[PDB]
Amino acid sequence: VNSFSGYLKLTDNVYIKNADIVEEAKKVKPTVVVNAANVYLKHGGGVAGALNKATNNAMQVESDDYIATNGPLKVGGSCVLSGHNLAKHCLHVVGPNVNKGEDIQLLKSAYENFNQHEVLLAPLLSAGIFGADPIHSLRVCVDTVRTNVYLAVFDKNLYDKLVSSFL
Ligand SMILES: CC1(C)C[C@@H](CO)N(c2ncnc3[nH]ccc23)C1
């Protein structure tokens, strides 16, 4: 039993809600919140910019030290950093950016990172400015993640479409 509220169950292990991941994190304070990061951990906009803003830029400061030490992440890769005031941990996951020509097949690799954590609050990956189709991303999530994932979908129209088209 966890403190997530009002989620629609999609499968044995996937739950979905029309919600802002930042507001969900502030309310629930989950063990793990997923960021839809880029390889540079430059948290400018979307999920990343909004999460970072909610940490008063502490996420960016921590991330810049991480990159200075370790270099960029791989597309499809991840790192675990602090969740600051939003969660215990933040799993920064890089999905492919289709507007950069990156391979959509790497979206499955990106979601595989979720399997290292028993429970996560997460956004849809690659489906923002990264240009991928959100229907496909949800299908990949469901077919890849085996741990318990609570998906926060920002756009109401998209949420309705994802639910009504979910197979
Ligand atoms: C609509 C997007 C460009 C795509 C989507 C991630 O696929 N995203 C968000 N999803 C959930 N909570 C969110 N808070 C702030 C942004 C945000 C931004």
Sign of the CA dihedral 54, 144, 19, 17?
negative
Residues touching ligand 1 (Cβ under 6 Å) are: 20-22, 36, 46-47, 50, 123-124, 127-128, 152, 154-155
Resolution of the entry in angstroms: 1.0
Q: Map out the domains of the chain as residue ranges.
A: 8-163
Which of 35, 92, 94, 154 to mutate to test ligand 1, by most ligand atoms within 8 A of the CB atom? 154
Q: How far are the Cα atoms of 17, 36, 63, 134 from residue 140, in angstroms, in the given order?
A: 17, 15, 27, 10
Cross-strand bridge partners of residue 78: 93
Crossing angle of helices 46-54 and 58-70, in 10° steps, is 120
Nearest to 17, CA basis, from 159, 138, 129: 159
Distance of CA 167 to the CA centre of its chain: 22
The fold for domain 8-163 equals Leucine Aminopeptidase, subunit E; domain 1 (3.40.220)
